[PDB]
Amino acid sequence: MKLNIANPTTGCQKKVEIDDDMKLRNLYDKRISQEVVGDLLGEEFEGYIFKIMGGCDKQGFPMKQGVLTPGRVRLLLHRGTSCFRGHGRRVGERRRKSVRGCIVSQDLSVINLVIVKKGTPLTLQRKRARIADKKKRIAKKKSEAAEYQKL
Amino acid sequence: AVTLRTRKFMTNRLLSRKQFVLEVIHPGRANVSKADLKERLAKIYEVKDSNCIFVFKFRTHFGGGKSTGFGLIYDNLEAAKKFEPKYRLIRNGLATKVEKSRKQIKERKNRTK
Amino acid sequence: ARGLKKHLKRLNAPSHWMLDKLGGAFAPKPSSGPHKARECLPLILILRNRLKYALTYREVQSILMQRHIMVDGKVRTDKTYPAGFMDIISIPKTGENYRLLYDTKGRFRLHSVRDEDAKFKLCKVRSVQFGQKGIPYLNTYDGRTIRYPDPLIKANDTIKLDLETNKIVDFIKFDVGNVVMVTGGRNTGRVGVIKNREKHKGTFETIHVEDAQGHQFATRLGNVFTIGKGTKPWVSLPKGKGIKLTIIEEQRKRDAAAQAA
RNA sequence: GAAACUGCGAAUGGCUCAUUAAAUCAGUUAUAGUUUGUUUGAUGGUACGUGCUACUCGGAUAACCGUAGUAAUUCUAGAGCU
RNA sequence: UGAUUCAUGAUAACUCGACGGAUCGCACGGCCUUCGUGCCGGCGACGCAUCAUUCAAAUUUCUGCCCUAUCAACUUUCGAUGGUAGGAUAGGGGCCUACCAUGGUGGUGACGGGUGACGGAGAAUUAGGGUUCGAUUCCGGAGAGGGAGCCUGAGAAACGGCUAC
Ligand SMILES: [Mg+2]
Ligand SMILES: [Mg+2]
Ligand SMILES: [Mg+2]
Ligand SMILES: [Mg+2]
Ligand SMILES: [Mg+2]
Ligand SMILES: [Mg+2]
Ligand SMILES: [Mg+2]
C-alpha cells in the first residue's frame, strides 16, 4: 500500500501512499523484479519506469523470490540469504520462517520499488624470496640424493 | 630486637628477580608489618629502590615469635611492572582497581549490532 | 564422548609427574606432540614444579613467551609441550642445558650437560620403510622422519642427531650386549647390559638385561633403549648410575649418610 | 583502535543415572579392517609453451549512510558506498 | 612382517581434479646494470596437499555380573545362522539387498520375567573365609520432557544447534 521509491541512478529515496483501486490494479498481480509503467499509477510518474522488487506486508513477513502464492507459507531457509540473516546463529543452522509469495496481493503494507528510467618493493621481495627458497630446495635434492646414491 | 633470615633463595634472570623464603624471628612483638619489612630488607640488600620488593604469604607460626613468607627482589621496576600479577602492585599502590556490574557487560550488548 | 578430551584431572595424571593431590582439580594436559603423552612431561612441569623459576601458571606463561625456553635446537612456546626421554632443554639466558632422563625409581630427572653433549640428541627408531618414488625413510619414537637412511640402520636401533646438520652422525645397532635402559614399567630407569633376547612368534620380544652389579631382569621391546655400544654409555648418566637399589640398601645409604655426620 | 567481515572454539567443562543384566564395564587383544582440526618432523616441478625456462589482476558484500513494515524477538525488504 | 598380491617402482590410461601461495609482518643494507628504494636479500605469521607422530575415536578377541524353572524350549516367511555378489560406511560385518543352503542358542540355565539395577576403581563390617552395598567429585557408558530426523564441522545424530509430532 505504502510504497518506497529509491533511485540507484542518484541515490535518494522517499516513501509515498496510494489509495485508489484503478491506480493500483495494474500494481497488483505482478511478481518481484518486473517493471511497471507509472503513468497510470500516478499522473506525475510518466516516463518513470518503476520496478517492483521486494516489499513486505503487515505482520512484517516479507515476500520471497520464487514462491508463487498470495499467501503466508512457512519455509526452511539458510542464513544469510533473503529473509534470513539470523545473526550469531551457529553457521549451518536453518530456521523455518514465515514468508509471503512473490506475486503482489491485497494484504501488503509496504512495497519496495526502484526506478529504471527517469523522465611494492615488499611484494617484489616476497616473489624473489619464494623463487630462491624453491631453487635452493631443488639443489638440496640434487645434493643429498646423489650423496646417498654413491654408496 | 627482631631479626630476619632468608633461605631457599634462588635467582631467576629469566624473570630477573631474587626469590626466597623469609623466616623472620620477632619475639615479644606480635608480628612485623610488611611495610616495615620493606625498608629493612632493602637496606640489607642495597636494592637502591625499596619498591621492587614484594612480600606475601605469611603465617606467624603457632606459639608466635616466628613467621614465614615469600620475598621477591626485583632488579628493575620495569621488570616488576611487566612480569607481575596486578593485585599486589595494587596492594603496594602501583596500580588501582575498578568495580564491575556484570549486567550488559556482554549479554544484552550481544543483541544490537 | 563426542570429541577429544581437552581437560586432564590431577588424579588421572601420570604417576611419575609427582604432582600433589590438593593442588587443584586439573593437570596440565600435555598437548599432542612428538612423544607418547603418557610418557612425557609438560614444560610447565619442567619449569614450575622442578626448577621453580616461576610460581604460577601465568608466570610460567611469562617464562615461555619470553622465547627463552629452547627445546631440541628450537624454541617452543607451548606450555603443555610433551617433552620426554632425551629431550634436551636449553636456556640461553642461564646458558644452562638440561637433558631429560629416567632415574632408577621410575621418574624424570633433568641432568645438566655441557654444550658439547648438548649439541646433539639420541633417540631410537620406530621403523624404516620406503616412501614416494622409492626413497627410504625411517621413523623414530620421537616422531622424527629421516630420509635416505644409512643402508645398515634398521628398526629398534638408536641414532644420534645433531641440531645443526640435523641428520645422522652415528647409530647403535640394537643387539645383544649393548648397554640399554628401560623406559617403561617397573624396571624403568635401570640401565644395564642386554644379556639375552628371545623372540616368540606373534608377540612382544623379551629382553633380558643385567645391571652393572649383578642383578638381572626382563623387559618388553617397546620399553628398552640402547644408549651406547658395549658397556660404555654415550650419555651422561644421573647421580645413580642406572642401578635401582633395593629399599633395604637405600635405607642403609641414608643411615650411613646420617652416621657420617 | 570500538562496530563489522573472515577464521577458530562452542563436540570441553559441568549435571544426572532414566533406559540398559555378555549388553555397557574391568582385565586382556586386534585394526594387515579404519577415520583423526591440531602438535611435531619430513615432504611437494610440467598450472601449459608445437615440454627448446611463466604469459593477466573480477565485482559485492557486511559494518556505515539512508527509506521502511511489524505490537513484536541478535523479526524482517529495499537504495547508495567500500 | 610372526604372517600379505606388503612398503614401493614401471606401465596404459582416467577425472569435467580437491591441490600444486594473486596472503600478511618488522629489520633494513653489501654493491650500480641504465648509479634509477636500483643486482638484490635474511628472520618470521598464515595457508594448501602427502606421509609419519601424537591427541583420540570407532569397531573388535577371550574370561568374568545380581534373583527367578509358578521362565524349557527360543530364533527363522518380514535376517534368524552361514555362503556368494553387490550396495552403503571411514572401514570389517546380514548393516542392507538378490539368490542359495537349513542352520544358530539351550539343564554348563538360552529365551523369558524381576531388579526400589548405570559398570568399575571402590565403601561398611571383618581371625580366616565371607555378607551387604557402590546415585555421587577418578575412569568408561547413556540422557538433556518423550520419541524420531538432519545442517555446519576434523569432531555432534549436539539439545546453553535446528526440523516435525
Ligand atoms: Mg563429558
Ligand atoms: Mg561383503
Ligand atoms: Mg535404573
Ligand atoms: Mg562421569
Ligand atoms: Mg549428548
Ligand atoms: Mg538430541
Ligand atoms: Mg540448559
Side-chain angles (χ1 to χ4, degrees), chain B residues 10-15 17 19 56 72 74 83 85 88, chain C residues 51-55 59 62-63 66 68-69 91 93-94:
Chain B
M10 182 179 72
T11 306
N12 63 6
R13 73 280 192 190
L14 293 177
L15 311 183
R17 67 184 184 272
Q19 63 207 327
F56 63 90
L72 295 174
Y74 290 98
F83 285 143
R88 65 185 183 273
Chain C
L51 311 155
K52 279 74 175 175
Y53 291 124
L55 295 175
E59 291 204 1
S62 296
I63 300 297
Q66 278 186 225
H68 291 334
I69 301 299
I91 297 89
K93 299 290 94 176
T94 67

Side-chain angles (χ1 to χ4, degrees), chain A:
Chain A
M1 295 299 102
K2 182 174 73 175
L3 283 68
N4 296 295
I5 301 90
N7 75 40
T9 300
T10 300
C12 57
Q13 65 182 357
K14 292 186 286 185
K15 63 92 175 179
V16 299
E17 293 179 354
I18 63 170
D19 291 331
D20 181 3
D21 269 332
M22 293 177 70
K23 293 182 183 292
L24 59 83
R25 293 315 197 182
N26 298 115
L27 184 64
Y28 282 15
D29 264 337
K30 302 215 154 183
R31 293 188 297 273
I32 301 299
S33 288
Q34 292 82 18
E35 293 83 3
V36 176
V37 297
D39 187 305
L40 60 84
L41 184 63
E43 204 269 347
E44 295 308 340
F45 305 90
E46 71 278 16
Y48 277 151
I49 301 299
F50 279 116
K51 184 177 180 180
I52 190 167
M53 50 82 75
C56 64
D57 62 357
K58 64 179 71 66
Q59 297 101 334
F61 303 117
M63 300 81 90
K64 274 191 82 53
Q65 184 67 222
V67 63
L68 300 94
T69 187
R72 190 196 299 174
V73 65
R74 294 178 64 87
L75 296 192
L76 194 68
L77 295 174
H78 294 88
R79 43 191 316 281
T81 61
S82 44
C83 185
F84 186 34
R85 278 86 69 191
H87 301 112
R89 275 264 181 280
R90 157 150 291 102
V91 64
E93 169 185 44
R94 294 176 294 182
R95 304 252 303 178
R96 187 177 295 275
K97 298 295 289 183
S98 280
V99 298
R100 297 293 297 165
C102 65
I103 52 161
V104 63
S105 199
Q106 174 191 87
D107 62 357
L108 294 175
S109 281
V110 64
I111 298 169
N112 291 102
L113 292 66
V114 299
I115 62 170
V116 167
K117 179 67 173 66
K118 177 190 160 297
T120 80
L122 287 76
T123 300
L124 298 180
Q125 197 193 0
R126 279 75 178 272
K127 316 278 172 73
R128 55 183 195 262
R130 293 179 182 176
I131 299 298
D133 300 2
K134 294 180 177 66
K135 278 72 177 175
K136 66 181 181 180
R137 178 168 77 136
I138 62 170
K140 180 266 290 180
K141 294 182 184 293
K142 277 72 177 175
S143 300
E144 58 191 62
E147 203 269 311
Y148 179 92
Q149 294 298 110
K150 67 191 196 68
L151 295 175

Side-chain angles (χ1 to χ4, degrees), chain C:
Chain C
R2 319 193 310 282
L4 305 189
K5 183 65 70 177
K6 300 292 179 68
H7 293 87
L8 188 153
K9 295 180 177 67
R10 292 179 64 87
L11 297 196
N12 193 0
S15 296
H16 62 86
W17 294 18
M18 293 179 183
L19 74 167
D20 52 306
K21 182 173 73 175
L22 293 174
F26 304 88
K29 183 46 163 163
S31 66
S32 179
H35 188 93
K36 177 62 145 183
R38 298 293 296 164
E39 184 178 1
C40 74
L41 294 175
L43 297 189
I44 189 167
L45 304 186
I46 298 315
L47 275 295
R48 181 185 59 190
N49 293 54
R50 312 301 170 82
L51 311 155
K52 279 74 175 175
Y53 291 124
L55 295 175
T56 62
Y57 197 67
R58 284 193 199 151
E59 291 204 1
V60 176
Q61 184 177 2
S62 296
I63 300 297
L64 293 173
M65 294 323 192
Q66 278 186 225
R67 296 291 185 269
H68 291 334
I69 301 299
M70 183 278 287
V71 182
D72 293 331
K74 63 180 71 65
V75 63
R76 300 291 178 90
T77 195
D78 183 295
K79 70 192 300 163
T80 71
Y81 185 58
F85 178 104
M86 283 163 218
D87 307 320
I88 61 170
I89 297 89
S90 301
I91 297 89
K93 299 290 94 176
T94 67
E96 182 65 26
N97 282 329
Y98 285 108
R99 174 200 283 291
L100 183 62
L101 293 175
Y102 285 86
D103 62 282
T104 61
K105 290 192 301 193
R107 295 188 298 273
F108 281 167
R109 282 295 94 92
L110 301 171
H111 189 300
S112 296
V113 297
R114 74 281 191 191
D115 291 331
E116 293 294 328
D117 63 358
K119 300 295 288 183
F120 77 117
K121 69 182 292 294
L122 187 152
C123 76
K124 57 179 311 185
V125 299
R126 187 190 317 266
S127 296
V128 63
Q129 285 159 30
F130 284 53
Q132 295 297 289
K133 293 187 286 185
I135 61 171
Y137 66 84
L138 61 83
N139 296 115
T140 73
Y141 280 99
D142 300 4
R144 298 193 154 61
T145 309
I146 302 299
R147 297 208 290 101
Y148 302 98
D150 292 331
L152 276 296
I153 190 65
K154 299 298 290 183
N156 296 151
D157 291 331
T158 311
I159 59 172
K160 317 185 281 222
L161 283 73
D162 310 323
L163 304 188
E164 160 180 0
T165 194
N166 214 25
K167 65 177 72 175
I168 302 299
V169 297
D170 181 284
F171 43 96
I172 298 89
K173 182 63 69 178
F174 174 92
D175 58 358
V176 172
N178 285 337
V179 65
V180 289
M181 62 80 71
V182 175
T183 61
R186 71 177 100 191
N187 298 339
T188 186
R190 311 140 65 80
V191 307
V193 165
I194 283 186
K195 66 185 289 184
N196 178 22
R197 188 161 57 62
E198 67 274 15
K199 64 183 181 293
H200 276 48
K201 294 182 184 293
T203 187
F204 60 89
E205 183 177 0
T206 61
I207 297 89
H208 294 268
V209 175
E210 183 178 1
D211 215 345
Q213 65 183 357
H215 301 93
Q216 156 158 7
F217 63 92
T219 290
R220 292 180 180 177
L221 183 63
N223 291 40
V224 290
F225 184 80
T226 60
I227 276 163
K229 200 178 167 190
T231 187
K232 64 174 199 53
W234 306 3
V235 66
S236 70
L237 277 297
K239 70 160 163 304
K241 185 175 174 66
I243 298 90
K244 179 67 174 67
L245 72 165
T246 301
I247 301 299
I248 297 169
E249 196 53 8
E250 80 184 18
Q251 190 54 14
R252 290 297 281 180
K253 294 186 70 176
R254 185 176 65 247
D255 291 331
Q259 64 87 30

